[PDB]
């Protein structure tokens, strides 16, 4: 039989554009099938063929040669891997386009993608299904906010990512300004109760609707410091795998992740992020297209779960076709 | 100033293709702005310019000349009215495409469109918000059904329309076959408790998120009969406007419709259908792109609400831009 052909799309117009491009190099090298690359420049225009690869020589591609509907053959590929993050990546827009093209693609479908990107709607569905989430309330522009809890809380646009337009309100006197800021990115915002101390845990899921979970990982912040020999050392995000979790908590994180995954009907993959506070777990968010770089959590979690990077990529493609 | 230019897209690949095409003639004649037409043939291919208009000469267009991404200028229009129903019409796919094109369009966005087309997810959100819906349960292929109620119930694929793949189960012995049928159209199905007697009411909403409601209408079936003078007379669907509703029930139907509309963040319009049984109301479904023909309920409801057909069309375009 002939080789199966995959089309990798990377870059994107969201602020996570550089993270995406960074993943491409790794996906191209390890995907177990011949793979072509197409890049979406920060300005929305696409780069195909030669220009796309050259684009991988930089941290970002503000270029763009082809206006949206790119002159791409599409018929030459069995599956499309839209490795794009946030707005115009994980929100169902690209998925919708690919559906109209009749092309099988990696990851969540239109409904699941759009839902998971809306902080309000996703939480409503999860709460309805019995999954714990942090107390929240949605607020729309023009509408009087009615936060049913303490002043320490986050305010953020409902359908965005990368922490853009987000504010941590200390006093109601600031709530007004915070919403006005958020509304600059989405007419709908959400106000979530800020927890403290709290720990962040992340788990990966692989499969169509009924998936398998990876071990649990923890995201820990390392403050900058003055080292005895090297002197100044910058702050850094530390990914702990496996997470130092007590007997039973790991199992509960995994069950909640898989349950939420099944309810929302997610396909292919998802990195589910949680908050752990006072021995209590809270589903924070589901990411249908998690970062895929070597340092990235999702691939490292499954590596610890016994699934090699190339194996992970191969399974994602196979799931797209089933 | 120059005339504003609108692009009407009609037809579609869903079984409601003929209903859509039928609307086009009426929209083209009454939309208060110069409007161009593009038709999506039943085979998925598009018809532009001259061929599109000629297509309006028949009840259906199985033709199609241009493969999906049609050679349409897009830049020549201020707003796009995708008057397509069901699958590849109201499910967020076309909406996603238009978003990537940066084109303002009539009706619900991607999230709301996909949600409203999923019978399971939409009900979960509505139940979460306190809106009454008929008891239901979602069942996925391979999963053991666990219906928490009586045997008389409907079984249907979760994300389809036009009543395709639907079955009315009389006895559990038939449940098996029913799901197998539904799964032929969607890996996820829903089992809803069938009510009886029950009446069907429909209300229209117009606006972005916070809308205004039209008067309430009732859908009544007229059985075929032998007339004294004309003899045989076929069965027919009777649209009663206003619906003969007791004092207070009309007001409750309207409140629930507007509340559901606001929660789901629907934009532009929606025809909300309800079930009335034992003095109890149940939100049946929200249709983001309701039929738009002269006999159609949505336009007639707003006509009764004082909004002329041309006025309705004009407002839909204005909302797309705000």
Domains and CATH numbers, chain B: 1-107 (3.40.50.20), 108-132+196-322 (3.30.470.20), 135-191 (3.30.1490.20)
* Closest-CA distance of chain B to residue A62, Å: 17
Residues 6+ apart with CB under 8 A from A99: A109, A110, B88, B93
Residues 6+ apart with CB under 8 A from B267: B107, B108, B109, B112, B208, B209, B319
Q: Which of A97, A110, A125 sits opposite B114 (nearest CB)?
A: A110
As a whole number of angstroms, the distance between CA B116 and CA A116 comes to 15
DSSP classification of residue A241: S
Q: In this complex, do A92 and B69 lie within 8 Å of one another by their Cβ atoms?
A: no
Q: In this complex, do B96 and A96 lie within 8 Å of one another by their Cβ atoms?
A: yes
As a whole number of angstroms, the distance between CA B86 and CA B13 comes to 9
Residue whose pair of structure tokens reads 């941290």 in the numeric block: A59
* Closest-CA distance of chain A to residue B258, Å: 15
Backbone phi, psi, residue B229, to 5°: -105, -45
Neighbours of A154 (CB within 10 A): 20
Residue whose pair of structure tokens reads 């292929």 in the numeric block: B141
Q: Which of B114, B121, B125 sits opposite A92 (nearest CB)?
A: B114
Please name the residue of chain A whose CA is at the shortest distance from the CA of residue B93.
A96
Q: Which of A88, A128, A188 sits opposite B100 (nearest CB)?
A: A88
| Bridge partners (DSSP) listed for residue B139 | B189
As a whole number of angstroms, the distance between CA B288 and CA A286 comes to 27
* Closest-CA distance of chain B to residue A57, Å: 26
Is A16 an active-site residue?
Answer: yes
| 3-state SS class at A248 | coil
Using a CB-CB cut-off of 8 Å, the residues of chain B touching A99 are 88, 93
* Closest-CA distance of chain A to residue B226, Å: 48
Using a CB-CB cut-off of 8 Å, the residues of chain A touching B128 are 124-125, 127-128
Is the torsion defined by CA of B318, B320, B321, B322 positive or negative?
positive
Is-contact B77 B93, C-beta < 8 A? no
| Distance spanning both ends of chain B, measured CA to CA | 19
As a whole number of angstroms, the distance between CA B92 and CA A113 comes to 11
Is-contact B172 B150, C-beta < 8 A? no
Per DSSP, the residues of B81-106 read EEE--STTTTSSHHHHHHHHTT--BS
- Indicate the length of chain B as a whole number: 322
- Residue B162 is assigned to a ligand binding site: yes
DSSP classification of residue A255: H
| 3-state SS class at A321 | coil
- Residue B193 is assigned to a ligand binding site: yes
Please name the residue of chain B whose CA is at the shortest distance from the CA of residue A128.
B128
Which segments of A183-285 does DSSP mark as H helices, in order?
A: 249-264
Is-contact B217 B239, C-beta < 8 A? yes
Interface size between A and B, measured as CB pairs under 8 A: 108
> Which one from B162, B212, B255, B311 is the annotated catalytic residue?
B162
Q: In this complex, do A94 and B99 lie within 8 Å of one another by their Cβ atoms?
A: no
As a whole number of angstroms, the distance between CA B285 and CA B119 comes to 8
Residues 6+ apart with CB under 8 A from B191: B136, B137, B139, B145, B147, B153, B154, B155, B169, B175
Is A113 an active-site residue?
Answer: no
Please name the residue of chain B whose CA is at the shortest distance from the CA of residue A116.
B111
Is-contact A119 A142, C-beta < 8 A? no
Residue whose pair of structure tokens reads 């830049």 in the numeric block: B75
* Closest-CA distance of chain A to residue B143, Å: 10
Residues 6+ apart with CB under 8 A from A254: A203, A213, A216
Q: In what order do the strands lie in the sheet with B212-222?
A: B236-240, B212-222, B199-206, B269-277, B280-287
Which helix (H) or strand (E) segment holds residue A298: the answer is helix A297-304
As a whole number of angstroms, the distance between CA B75 and CA B61 comes to 26
Tell me which residue of B27, B26, B22 sits closest to B8, measured CA to CA.
Answer: B27
Q: Which of B114, B126, B140 to substitute to test the interface with A, most A CBs within 10 Å? A: B114
> Which one from A99, A296, A303, A311 is the annotated catalytic residue?
A296
Q: In this complex, do B97 and A101 lie within 8 Å of one another by their Cβ atoms?
A: no
DSSP classification of residue A164: T
Three-state helix/strand/coil letters over A74-133: CCCCCEEEEECCCCCCCCCHHHHHHHHCCCCECCCCHHHHHHHHCHHHHHHHHHHCCCCC
| Distance spanning both ends of chain A, measured CA to CA | 19
Residues of B engaging A, defined by a Cβ cutoff of 8 Å: 44, 68-69, 88, 91-97, 99-102, 110-111, 114-115, 117-118, 121, 124-125, 127-129, 140, 142, 159, 187-188, 209-210, 262-265
Is-contact B217 B224, C-beta < 8 A? no
- Residue B51 is assigned to a ligand binding site: no
Backbone phi, psi, residue B316, to 5°: -60, -40
């Amino acid at each position: 039989m002939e080789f199966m052909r995959v089309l990798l799309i990377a870059g994107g117009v969201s602020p996570e554009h550089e993270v995406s491009l960074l993943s491409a190099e790794g996906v191209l090298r390890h995907i177990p099938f011949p793979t072509d690359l197409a890049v979406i420049a920060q300005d929305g225009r696409w780069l195909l063929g030669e220009k796309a690869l050259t684009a991988l020589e930089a941290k970002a591609a503000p270029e763009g040669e082809h206006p949206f509907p790119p002159p791409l053959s599409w018929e030459r590929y069995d599956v499309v891997f839209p490795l794009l993050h946030g707005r115009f990546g994980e929100d169902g827009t690209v998925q919708g386009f690919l559906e109209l093209l009749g092309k099988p693609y990696v990851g969540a479908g239109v409904a699941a993608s759009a839902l998971c990107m809306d902080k309000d709607l996703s939480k409503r569905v999860l709460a309805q299904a019995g999954v714990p989430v942090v107390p929240w309330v949605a607020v729309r522009k023009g509408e009087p906010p009615v936060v049913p809890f303490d002043p320490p809380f986050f305010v953020k646009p409902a359908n965005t990512g990368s922490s853009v337009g987000i504010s941590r309100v200390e006093r109601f006197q600031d709530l007004e300004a915070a919403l006005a800021l958020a509304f600059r990115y989405d007419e709908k915002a959400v106000v979530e109760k800020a927890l403290s101390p709290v720990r962040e845990l992340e788990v990966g899921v692989l499969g169509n609707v009924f998936g398998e979970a990876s071990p649990v990982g923890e995201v820990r912040y390392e403050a900058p410091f003055y080292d005895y020999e090297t002197k100044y050392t910058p702050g850094r995000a530390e990914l702990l795998i496996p997470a130092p979790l007590d007997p039973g908590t790991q199992e509960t994180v995994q069950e909640l992740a898989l349950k939420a995954y099944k309810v929302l009907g997610v396909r292919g993959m998802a990195r589910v992020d949680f908050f752990l506070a006072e021995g209590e777990l809270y589903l924070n968010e589901l990411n249908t297209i998690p970062g895929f770089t070597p340092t990235s959590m999702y691939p490292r979690l499954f590596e610890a779960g016994g699934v090699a990077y190339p194996e992970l990529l191969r399974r994602l493609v196979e799931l797209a076709l089933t």
